[PDB]
């Protein structure tokens, strides 16, 4: 994701405010970062209580795509 | 009123195709230079920019008048109507005068026929930078000028006592370099056209090693110490000392690529890329040492056990020694 | 409005000694500060125009010094015909004057 952003920004002017493409890339980066942090949280409680770890994995499987779809719909209805 | 009469009398029956003293003696021209700024010095094109006020003075007995007026102070309007020396800069990739809002030119004619002619110039002057010892490299490269078509028998240039004057040097555009002084020189060069008096001004520039330090040297040594960090990791077949090594190598090669792209494509070895190559050898040595250690784990455990500490001590000492040798050799040169 | 503060309001001094008058500008006024001398029952007379430019006929003992917001008028070998009000005025914007300094003999 960082590579995508860096390649994109090398073709625009140095603009202060946030562009819509920047908003989308930031949101996607936040999603990836949240996935990594969710894995770290799982690993923090792996040994002590694997049941809640499995529950968290299932909940993530269910609720990452849903929140991503909601964010996409919000983004594409705000601008278009 | 009567200055118009003087000007009309001066130009009547006057031929600006002929230099003063056409068939008598060479025309002597005294030159002065005021250096406004010395622009960026891009080693990629081996050139530097310079903005100057260029003053030329000579005697023209045809421009001789008698009046209470002692000096005629004129603008560029009359420059094209009298004879002007065809001075050009020999090592200039390109140059241009300034023309806004009017031609930045000045002409003054004195009672006895002395002429002063000044104009503003920006010049991109070529000089070949020998980039050995870069970025600990010092250069003194010239600005040469002469007449194009008049050989020594016809025009002779002469530096005044205070010919070259510099400004403040605080507002100049020298980033990698610092101005440390200058000197002027004269000589005669032989060409297919004839012998020409060539005047030269040498500007002494020393590179300041503050940008390249933080741009290349610190990251490379930091990568080297990161490579060292591997020697303390748990000693096994763990990928923590394999991925670490290979990532160190790829970062090293990327840094080398960027650093070399900093400067022009010269076939010889600079001081910077020797350092990068040595830091590139150190990381490879650490990685191969780990490989051999892991191979010997299966054969001899004590061998690997003592090898880890031996590398842990032999690497930083060798790196410090190389740093000392490198900096001592290059700084005292 | 640019208000100019002049100090001291009044100062009594003896002949032949260096006396300095200070003017302070509320805002930036590059060098468009003038010093005028007004003798009793007389119109003001321009002494210094711009910053540190003696006007014609002004004795060389009147010296002006300036800045972006701090200006001083310096009199050197004072004489007895210098007893007058001294005003500083800016001209960077619509002109404004200070209160003035009443020179005294003592």
């Amino acid at each position: 994701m960082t590579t995508i952003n860096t390649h994109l920004r090398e073709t625009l002017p140095k603009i202060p405010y946030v562009k819509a493409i920047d908003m989308y890339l930031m949101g996607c980066f936040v999603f990836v970062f949240m996935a990594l942090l969710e894995y770290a949280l799982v690993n923090y409680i792996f040994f002590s209580q694997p049941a809640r770890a499995a529950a968290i994995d299932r909940w993530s499987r269910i609720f990452f795509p849903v929140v991503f779809s909601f964010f996409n719909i919000v983004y594409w209805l705000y601008y278009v | 009123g009567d200055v118009t009469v003087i000007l009309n009398n001066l130009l009547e029956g006057y031929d600006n195709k002929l230099r003063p003293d056409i068939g008598v003696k060479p025309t002597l021209i005294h030159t002065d230079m005021y250096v406004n700024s010395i622009g960026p010095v891009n080693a990629i094109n081996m050139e530097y920019t310079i903005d100057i006020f260029f003053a030329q003075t000579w005697y023209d007995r045809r421009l001789k008048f008698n009046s209470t007026i002692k000096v005629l102070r004129l603008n560029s309007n009359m420059v094209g109507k009298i004879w002007i020396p065809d001075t050009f800069f020999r090592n200039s990739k390109k140059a241009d005068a300034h023309w806004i809002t009017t031609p930045n030119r000045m002409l003054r004619i004195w009672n006895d026929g002395r002429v002063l002619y000044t104009l503003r110039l920006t010049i991109d002057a070529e000089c070949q930078l020998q980039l050995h010892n870069f970025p600990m490299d010092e250069h003194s490269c010239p600005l040469e000028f002469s007449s194009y078509g008049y050989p020594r028998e016809e025009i002779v240039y002469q530096w005044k006592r205070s010919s070259v004057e510099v400004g403040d040097t605080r507002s100049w555009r020298l980033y990698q370099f610092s101005f440390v002084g200058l000197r002027n020189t004269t000589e005669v060069v032989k060409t297919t056209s004839g012998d020409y008096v060539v005047m030269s001004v040498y500007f002494d520039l020393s590179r300041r090693m503050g940008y390249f330090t933080i741009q290349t040297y610190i990251p490379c040594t930091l990568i080297v110490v990161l490579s060292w960090v591997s020697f303390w990791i748990n000693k096994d077949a763990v990928p923590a000392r394999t991925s670490l090594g290979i990532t160190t190598v790829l970062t090293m090669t990327t840094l080398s690529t960027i650093a070399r792209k900093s400067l022009p494509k010269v076939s010889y070895v600079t001081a910077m890329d020797l350092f990068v190559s040595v830091c590139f050898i150190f990381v490879f040595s650490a990685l191969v040492e780990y490989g051999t250690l892991h191979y010997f784990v299966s054969s001899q455990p004590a061998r690997a056990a003592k090898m880890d500490s031996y590398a842990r001590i032999f690497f930083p000492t060798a790196f410090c020694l190389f740093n000392l040798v490198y900096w001592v050799s290059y700084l005292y040169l | 409005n640019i208000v100019m503060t002049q100090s001291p309001k009044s100062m009594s001094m003896s002949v032949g000694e260096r006396v300095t008058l200070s003017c302070k500008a509320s805002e930036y006024v590059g060098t468009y500060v003038s010093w005028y001398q007004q003798k009793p029952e007389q119109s003001p007379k321009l002494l210094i125009y711009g910053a540190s430019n003696r006007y014609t006929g002004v004795p060389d003992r009147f010296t002006g010094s300036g800045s972006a917001t701090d200006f001083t008028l310096t009199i050197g070998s004072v004489q007895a015909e210098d007893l007058a009000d001294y005003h500083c005025g800016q001209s960077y914007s619509y002109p404004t004057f200070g209160a003035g300094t009443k020179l005294e003999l003592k």
Partner: protein, 104 residues
Amino acid sequence: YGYTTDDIEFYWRGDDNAVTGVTKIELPQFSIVDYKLITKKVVFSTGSYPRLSLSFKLKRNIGYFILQTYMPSILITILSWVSFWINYDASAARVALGITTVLT
């Protein structure tokens, strides 16, 4: 351009010293092997015109390319070979080595 070969003739003054300064040229990436001076005539639809050709033979210096692009390839190939000295049990290590070498 305008004057055909019966109006104008071109020739080198000296025929070998007409061109000077070649040996003093230094190029960062090339070396001037040599140069030739040619006299010929070229035919166009509007007539035949004199022509002079000056040509340089430039050889590229190799050392810069060696340093910048060749060594890294050999070094990455050797680092890929290093995978053979790792035991087959360490799948992650060998696969990381190979993939990283491909990426490099």
